[PDB]
Design a protein around this ligand. Structure first.
Ligand SMILES: Cc1cn([C@H]2C[C@H](O)[C@@H](CNC(=S)Nc3ccc(Cl)c(C(F)(F)F)c3)O2)c(=O)[nH]c1=O
Length: 200
């Protein structure tokens, strides 16, 4: 009746870490293996909430640090019913960015308290695995600056030792990064299981 049957994979990483390259490669690989999979992205800029987030990111409005933080969290909550329904049926979800982005970006770029940042996402569906595309920032949107990216790299380390968190050296060839990811995916437990939730 109520078991999670599909698998839920999140990609995390700084901007231009290769997330969408790798997530598209993973989705293609799963589809070639007959697995039904939905590719989702956060923020979803299409929703009423996402359209405001979009203005914020393009600097078409300005918003206070707590206001935008909470909108990013509400934007995930408005997808929970749909993600749950997919996973309950056995459809997999590959998702570019999630609650980890919310915490790392707001604490890193906006200097918000980590616990305060985590609280609104408590209760979101927990993914089976997070692939963190690790690219030290050594080299249009509000967080674009290399100075801003360096602060976020540090804050992402908050999650580095959780057993769901898989560090991926994203400085390697694209094919080799993808092979690395496919390998970890084959380790995911096959059978249905109870849903788990952040930040358990
Ligand atoms: C899910 C989520 C995302 N973000 C930020 C992360 C990222 O800095 C920003 C960028 N998002 C998207 S969809 N695209 C994007 C495209 C180009 C460029 Cl240059 C950038 C950025 F400015 F970040 F570099 C971002 O959205 C957040 O700040 N909090 C969140 O919870």
């Amino acid at each position: 009746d109520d078991k999670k049957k599909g698998k839920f994979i999140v990609f995390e990483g700084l901007d231009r870490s290769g997330k969408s390259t790798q997530s598209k490669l993973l989705v293609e690989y799963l589809k070639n293996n007959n697995v039904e999979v939905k590719h989702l992205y956060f923020p979803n800029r299409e929703t009423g909430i996402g359209q405001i987030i979009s203005k914020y990111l393009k600097m078409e409005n300005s918003m206070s640090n707590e206001t935008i933080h909470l909108l990013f969290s509400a934007n995930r909550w408005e997808h929970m019913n749909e993600i749950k329904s997919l996973l309950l049926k056995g459809i997999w979800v590959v998702c570019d960015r999630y609650a980890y982005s919310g915490v790392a970006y707001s604490s890193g770029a906006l200097n918000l308290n980590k616990t305060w940042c985590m609280n609104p996402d408590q209760g979101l569906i927990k993914p089976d695995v997070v692939f963190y595309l690790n690219v030290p920032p050594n080299y249009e949107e509000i967080y674009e600056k290399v100075e801003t990216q360096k602060k976020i790299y540090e804050t992402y380390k908050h999650f580095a030792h959780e057993d769901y968190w898989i560090n991926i050296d994203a400085t390697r060839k694209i094919e080799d990064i993808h092979n690395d990811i496919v390998k970890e995916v084959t380790k995911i437990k096959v059978e249905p299981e109870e849903f788990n939730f952040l930040w358990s």
